[PDB]
Amino acid sequence: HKSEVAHRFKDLGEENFKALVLIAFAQYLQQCPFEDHVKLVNEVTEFAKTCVADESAENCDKSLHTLFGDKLCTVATLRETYGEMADCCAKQEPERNECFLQHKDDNPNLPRLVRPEVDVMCTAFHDNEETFLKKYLYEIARRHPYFYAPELLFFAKRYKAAFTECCQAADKAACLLPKLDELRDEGKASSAKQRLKCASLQKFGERAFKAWAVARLSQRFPKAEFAEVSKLVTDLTKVHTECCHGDLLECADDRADLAKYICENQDSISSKLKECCEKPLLEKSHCIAEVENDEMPADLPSLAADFVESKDVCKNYAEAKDVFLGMFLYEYARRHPDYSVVLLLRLAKTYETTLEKCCAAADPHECYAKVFDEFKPLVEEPQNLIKQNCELFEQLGEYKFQNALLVRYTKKVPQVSTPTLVEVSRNLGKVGSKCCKHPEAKRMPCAEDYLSVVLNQLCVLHEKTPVSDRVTKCCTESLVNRRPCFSALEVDETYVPKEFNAETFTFHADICTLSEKERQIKKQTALVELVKHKPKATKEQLKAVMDDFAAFVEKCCKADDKETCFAEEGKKLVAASQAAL
Ligand SMILES: CCCCCCCCCCCCCCCC(=O)O
Ligand SMILES: CCCCCCCCCCCCCCCC(=O)O
Numbered sequence: 001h002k003s004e005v006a007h008r009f010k011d012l013g014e015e016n017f018k019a020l021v022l023i024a025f026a027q028y029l030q031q032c033p034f035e036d037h038v039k040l041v042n043e044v045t046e047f048a049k050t051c052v053a054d055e056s057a058e059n060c061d062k063s064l065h066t067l068f069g070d071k072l073c074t075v076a077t078l079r080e081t082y083g084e085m086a087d088c089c090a091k092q093e094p095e096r097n098e099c100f101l102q103h104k105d106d107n108p109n110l111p112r113l114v115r116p117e118v119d120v121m122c123t124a125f126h127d128n129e130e131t132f133l134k135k136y137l138y139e140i141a142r143r144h145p146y147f148y149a150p151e152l153l154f155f156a157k158r159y160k161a162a163f164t165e166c167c168q169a170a171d172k173a174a175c176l177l178p179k180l181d182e183l184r185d186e187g188k189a190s191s192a193k194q195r196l197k198c199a200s201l202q203k204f205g206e207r208a209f210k211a212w213a214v215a216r217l218s219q220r221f222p223k224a225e226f227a228e229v230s231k232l233v234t235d236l237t238k239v240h241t242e243c244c245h246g247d248l249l250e251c252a253d254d255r256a257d258l259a260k261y262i263c264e265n266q267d268s269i270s271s272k273l274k275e276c277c278e279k280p281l282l283e284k285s286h287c288i289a290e291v292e293n294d295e296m297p298a299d300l301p302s303l304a305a306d307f308v309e310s311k312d313v314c315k316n317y318a319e320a321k322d323v324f325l326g327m328f329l330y331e332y333a334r335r336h337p338d339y340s341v342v343l344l345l346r347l348a349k350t351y352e353t354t355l356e357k358c359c360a361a362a363d364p365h366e367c368y369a370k371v372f373d374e375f376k377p378l379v380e381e382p383q384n385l386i387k388q389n390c391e392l393f394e395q396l397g398e399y400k401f402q403n404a405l406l407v408r409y410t411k412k413v414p415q416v417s418t419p420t421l422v423e424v425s426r427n428l429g430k431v432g433s434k435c436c437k438h439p440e441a442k443r444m445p446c447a448e449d450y451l452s453v454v455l456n457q458l459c460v461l462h463e464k465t466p467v468s469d470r471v472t473k474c475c476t477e478s479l480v481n482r483r484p485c486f487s488a489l490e491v492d493e494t495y496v497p498k499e500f501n502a503e504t505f506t507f508h509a510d511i512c513t514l515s516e517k518e519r520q521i522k523k524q525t526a527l528v529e530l531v532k533h534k535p536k537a538t539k540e541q542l543k544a545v546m547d548d549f550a551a552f553v554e555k556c557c558k559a560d561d562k563e564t565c566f567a568e569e570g571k572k573l574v575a576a577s578q579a580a581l
């Protein structure tokens, strides 16, 4: 590589290059208007083509960081707007790059992106496809400035694919808004996992990260040897150290090295990787991360022969403890893709705890011969809740199931704000939908994925304005004990029933004109506020107050003079409901 830009432009192509340079600049300079970044992109691009044409041409010998910082420092509004960022420009490059990273603000005071009417978007899409898309790519990019750029680009192409389909359609909103909802969900889910991988590495350490990674890579490449899994977990640990630090260009260099490696040693890693390795430079790593489990080898020995019965277990443990526990977790994991990653680490921590007592003890082989019995119950805890909650989701719909949860959690933690309880109850139910459609074989890894990002979001909102110490306990616990902690919460026996507020239980005639989505949030808020007023109420009592409410609405949204009904029946509903509690 005589020219780094020339090469990236060859490996990426003009279109991909422009998009990535835009995303890159919208991530450092988050307050400049769209049309200034377009001028910048086109000048960086005009210059890249100079180097493609002639590797020896003026300025083509320079580093990507060096060229990037230079173009950043040409902006004249820079001092007046960003201030301290401008002071970086005084430095020489190795120090200067580090300075632009220190002054990258996650979430500035930027207004929420309004979704326009479907009609507005489709007309816009048709009339100038490109500038419609880059303008929206520039908006997401300035708001989520630590969102790895190629993944952001990958989402972009799926928005483009949603409009191409749904603007030439029968009914646009019913086509498009679900596509856009599924995408928004994944963009929010993906942004949470990057945040979470990085918070995990810092708050818990290199050791629990590798543990997590070994469990993971072994479930997915079960035919690979442990030496090979080690090698991948080493390089992945470097990858995330670096990608957390924020240097887009060095983060991208590492992931691609990893994908180049994995595709060459494909033979000795996984059969299900042929497709991902035919894909071009940009997509490779992203694709490999999404790869399916390889099938495990047919008849695989039970583990007690080497980790429980055999002598020289302690003599193997003591030699190198973490590598032997690694040996273990690999072996356990590759036999059990139906387990959550955290289940497997709960087990490996259990085997650790015993080998500590029993290898320092009078008789080793005897003290720990029944260690596998400790597993049995640990395994059944998450399996039972999935048996039980997907039983309940099947009886009631998605929506009525959300209301079971909302009553459950409001009783466990009644101090939490109402919009928050309503929101997480609704997501838990959505997890219900996506995960209960999988068979027992796949349910626990499904939940692990969705619960971890629902639970991370929960602990952030709590960090900001705390509310319960029991919730603070669950959020300042190991990653392995996060979900059992939430699960171990009991109905708050201390909670003082809150003051009845009349207004809270008054319904006007507008809840007939609302959407199904809005109606549900209105009613759901009233259920929370009801469980907060009468915590000590039975499933039959609350089923009765609920059904009285079902008839009351149905009676008033199907009669002449809807409004006087809603205040006259309303008087009656409240008094009768007061009395039955
Ligand atoms: C490839 C080598 C990686 C090393 C893997 C070590 C296996 C560790 C098993 C314990 C899981 C982490 C739980 C620690 C909880 C705690 O510190 O309280
Ligand atoms: C003045 C220079 C501006 C910067 C030039 C564009 C930089 C884009 C680099 C992204 C390359 C992505 C490499 C593949 C890694 C991956 O697959 O995740």
Ligand SMILES: CCCCCCCCCCCCCCCC(=O)O
Residues within 6 Å of the ligand: 385, 409, 412, 413, 416, 420, 424, 458, 459, 461, 462, 471, 483, 486, 487, 488
């Ligand atoms: C701002 C903090 C909000 C706190 C909300 C507390 C409600 C608890 C939610 C727990 C859901 C996790 C699944 C637990 C499974 C179980 O019920 O056993």
